[PDB]
Design a protein around this nucleic acid. Structure first.
Length: 266
DNA sequence: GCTGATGCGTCGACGGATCC
DNA sequence: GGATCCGTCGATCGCATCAGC
């Protein structure tokens, strides 16, 4: 079935207006994404903070369009020492920025919350890297738990797992596939329990099917909405009263993932 | 400098078997 | 004998390096 994301809810459950708009996007090659007008879409979305995954670009090769973003002028980039890579771009300067826990994680502390963006390792075709993914999950959980700040956490990005059967179109046939193994699903559950965190989208839309953020380029999967929900905003419990909406920007092209957008009343 | 071949990381369609 | 379950296989894209001119 096709999916139509509901309209943006910009007011919190207690009636407060959103003050902060965060967008996350696995861009499948930043340079290619820019050529496919991805930055035009970012400008229309006008987030306060933009998190990017799979940049496949070292800082010295960032296209010139990226220094024409006056509303996203504080930019931090991390790559493995033309694969992987993540970026964080922000209207206001963060207080602190750090990298790692490999070019997969950026941590940025703001006035009232800590933002982590991640590009979680893929278990691989034939699960050849599943054990590494499980060891990585465990190290990542411990890292997030051990964050020194008492500030609440927003974790966003491509977490490379569809948590539950409702998070992908073909759950039965994919239970031995990267992104839907019982091992990866379990690690996501432990992340939520251990940190702790809530899945913003699922909190608001607990029974909504066919809501995905990734479609394989093969077999015209996106045209059929045969997809997976791999990209998330996970929030500390204390931020739920501030949660206004968690969006899936299904129509935004340029990658095999679509953007996701969070509105918080802070 | 530029193109194209190749390598690497990144599952839905399909055929067959089992169940009642 | 329709529904379901399971294992197999070809395949999109972006970026790298390499060979050639």
């Amino acid at each position: 079935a096709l999916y139509e994301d509901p309209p943006d809810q910009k007011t919190s459950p207690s009636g407060k207006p959103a003050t902060l708009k965060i967008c996350s996007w696995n861009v499948d090659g930043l340079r290619a994404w820019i050529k496919k007008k991805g930055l035009d879409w970012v400008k229309e979305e006008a987030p306060d903070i933009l998190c990017l995954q799979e940049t496949k670009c070292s800082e010295n090769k960032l296209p010139a369009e990226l220094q024409e973003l006056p509303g996203l002028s504080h930019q931090y980039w991390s790559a493995p020492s033309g694969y992987s890579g993540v970026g964080l771009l922000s209207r206001q300067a963060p207080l602190k920025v750090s990298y790692g826990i490999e070019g997969r994680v950026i941590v940025a502390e703001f006035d009232s919350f800590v933002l982590v963006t991640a590009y979680v390792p893929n278990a691989g075709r034939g699960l050849v890297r599943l054990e590494y993914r499980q060891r990585w999950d465990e190290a990542f959980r411990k890292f997030l738990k051990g964050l020194a700040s008492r500030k609440p956490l927003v974790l966003c990005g491509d977490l490379n797992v569809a948590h539950e059967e409702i998070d992908l179109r073909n759950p039965k046939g994919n239970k031995k596939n990267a992104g839907f193994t019982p091992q990866e699903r379990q690690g996501f559950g432990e992340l939520l329990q251990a940190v702790p965190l809530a899945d913003s989208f699922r909190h608001l839309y607990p029974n909504t099917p066919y809501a995905y953020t990734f479609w394989t380029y093969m077999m015209n999967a996106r045209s059929k909405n045969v997809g997976w929900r791999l990209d998330y905003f996970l929030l500390s419990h204390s931020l739920l009263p501030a949660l206004c909406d968690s969006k899936i920007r299904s129509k935004a092209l340029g990658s095999d993932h679509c953007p996701i957008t969070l509105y918080l009343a802070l």
